[PDB]
Design a protein around this motif. Structure first.
Motif, mmCIF file in Angstrom:
data_model
loop_
_atom_site.group_PDB
_atom_site.id
_atom_site.type_symbol
_atom_site.label_atom_id
_atom_site.label_comp_id
_atom_site.label_asym_id
_atom_site.label_seq_id
_atom_site.Cartn_x
_atom_site.Cartn_y
_atom_site.Cartn_z
ATOM 1 N N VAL B 14 0.892 -0.859 -0.330
ATOM 2 C CA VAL B 14 0.206 0.057 -0.097
ATOM 3 C C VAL B 14 1.157 1.187 0.163
ATOM 4 C CG1 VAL B 14 -0.221 0.254 2.439
ATOM 5 C CG2 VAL B 14 -2.026 1.346 0.951
ATOM 6 N N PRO B 15 0.894 2.059 -0.840
ATOM 7 C CA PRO B 15 -0.260 2.465 -1.829
ATOM 8 C C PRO B 15 0.044 1.617 -3.102
ATOM 9 C CG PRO B 15 0.768 4.183 -2.219
ATOM 10 C CD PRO B 15 1.524 3.012 -0.612
ATOM 11 N N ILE B 16 -0.837 0.109 -3.716
ATOM 12 C CA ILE B 16 -0.403 0.621 -5.197
ATOM 13 C C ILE B 16 0.124 1.404 -6.013
ATOM 14 C CG2 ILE B 16 -1.657 -1.302 -7.175
ATOM 15 C CD1 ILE B 16 -3.203 -2.219 -5.301
ATOM 16 N N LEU B 17 0.819 1.741 -6.852
ATOM 17 C CA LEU B 17 1.668 2.250 -7.865
ATOM 18 C C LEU B 17 1.834 2.023 -9.027
ATOM 19 C CD1 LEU B 17 4.658 2.928 -5.602
ATOM 20 C CD2 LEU B 17 2.905 4.075 -5.553
ATOM 21 N N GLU B 33 0.479 -5.102 -9.642
ATOM 22 C CA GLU B 33 0.719 -5.324 -11.216
ATOM 23 C C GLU B 33 1.399 -6.748 -10.948
ATOM 24 O OE1 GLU B 33 2.246 -1.821 -12.572
ATOM 25 O OE2 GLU B 33 1.412 -1.883 -14.285
ATOM 26 N N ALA B 34 2.158 -6.932 -9.970
ATOM 27 C CA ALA B 34 2.835 -7.863 -10.083
ATOM 28 C C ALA B 34 2.216 -9.219 -9.269
ATOM 29 C CB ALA B 34 4.728 -7.440 -8.806
ATOM 30 N N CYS B 35 1.818 -8.961 -8.138
ATOM 31 C CA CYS B 35 0.424 -10.313 -8.217
ATOM 32 C C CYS B 35 -0.331 -10.501 -9.102
ATOM 33 C CB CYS B 35 -0.254 -9.529 -6.831
ATOM 34 S SG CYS B 35 0.986 -9.574 -5.589
ATOM 35 N N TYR B 36 -1.055 -9.555 -9.982
ATOM 36 C CA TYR B 36 -1.928 -9.478 -11.298
ATOM 37 C C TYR B 36 -0.991 -10.789 -12.104
ATOM 38 C CZ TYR B 36 -4.236 -9.866 -15.343
ATOM 39 O OH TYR B 36 -5.297 -9.879 -16.476
ATOM 40 N N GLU B 37 0.262 -10.458 -12.245
ATOM 41 C CA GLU B 37 0.887 -11.392 -13.303
ATOM 42 C C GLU B 37 1.464 -12.202 -12.596
ATOM 43 O OE1 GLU B 37 3.050 -6.835 -15.482
ATOM 44 O OE2 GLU B 37 4.626 -8.521 -14.822
ATOM 45 N N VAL B 38 1.954 -12.448 -11.337
ATOM 46 C CA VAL B 38 2.762 -13.966 -10.482
ATOM 47 C C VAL B 38 1.860 -15.102 -9.757
ATOM 48 C CG1 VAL B 38 4.868 -13.001 -11.606
ATOM 49 C CG2 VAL B 38 4.000 -13.023 -8.944
ATOM 50 N N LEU B 39 0.601 -14.975 -8.824
ATOM 51 C CA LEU B 39 -0.285 -15.202 -8.339
ATOM 52 C C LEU B 39 -1.229 -16.060 -8.982
ATOM 53 C CD1 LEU B 39 -0.595 -13.121 -5.274
ATOM 54 C CD2 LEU B 39 1.316 -14.423 -5.671
ATOM 55 N N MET B 54 -10.719 -8.383 -14.523
ATOM 56 C CA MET B 54 -10.181 -7.482 -13.770
ATOM 57 C C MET B 54 -9.941 -6.202 -15.351
ATOM 58 S SD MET B 54 -9.660 -9.207 -10.862
ATOM 59 C CE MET B 54 -7.976 -8.978 -9.437
ATOM 60 N N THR B 55 -10.154 -5.691 -14.141
ATOM 61 C CA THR B 55 -10.071 -4.305 -15.230
ATOM 62 C C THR B 55 -8.533 -3.273 -14.539
ATOM 63 O OG1 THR B 55 -10.465 -2.363 -16.325
ATOM 64 C CG2 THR B 55 -11.429 -2.886 -14.142
ATOM 65 N N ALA B 56 -7.643 -2.605 -15.722
ATOM 66 C CA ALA B 56 -6.436 -2.017 -15.513
ATOM 67 C C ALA B 56 -7.033 -0.744 -15.085
ATOM 68 C CB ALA B 56 -5.555 -2.540 -15.724
ATOM 69 N N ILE B 57 -6.707 -0.612 -13.444
ATOM 70 C CA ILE B 57 -7.363 1.645 -13.410
ATOM 71 C C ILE B 57 -6.002 2.089 -13.544
ATOM 72 C CG2 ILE B 57 -8.111 2.545 -11.709
ATOM 73 C CD1 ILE B 57 -10.857 0.374 -11.588
#
Ligand code: NI
Ligand code: NI
Ligand SMILES: [Zn+2]
Ligand SMILES: [Zn+2]
Ligand SMILES: [Zn+2]
Ligand SMILES: [Zn+2]
Lengths: 59, 59
Positions: B14-17, B33-39, B54-57
């Motif tokens: 936190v905060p997401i950047l 972004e990192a979790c979205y890519e690898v989790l 999911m949508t990128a904001i």
């Protein structure tokens, strides 16, 4: 998730970590440790003033 | 000052950047972004599931 965090009114760092120096007079004013130690008294964001008591609050 | 920030539901950063991958179905779910890519989905907290769009904001 949405999360309430403390943001420094002196430098805009967010979150303030570990402890925040909090104004007892202003509505919602916090400084990080570095700003509390280094900000010049005449460069505080109005309406915060140097006579306002500040308290160290654990995060 | 008190500030609303986005916290990652995968790693708690936190905060997401930059941008946050936001769930369209859950009430308040975000990944950095990192979790979205690898989790993998099995690592993500119920009731979030892999079929949720999911949508990128931008932050
Ligand atoms: Ni207060
Ligand atoms: Ni939403
Ligand atoms: Zn600061
Ligand atoms: Zn003040
Ligand atoms: Zn994350
Ligand atoms: Zn979801």
């Amino acid at each position: 998730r949405s999360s309430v965090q403390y943001c420094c009114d002196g430098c805009s760092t967010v979150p303030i970590l570990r402890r925040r120096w909090h104004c007892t007079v202003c509505p919602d004013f916090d400084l990080c440790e570095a700003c509390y130690e280094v900000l010049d008294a005449d460069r505080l964001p109005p309406p915060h003033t140097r006579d306002h008591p500040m308290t160290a609050i654990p995060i």
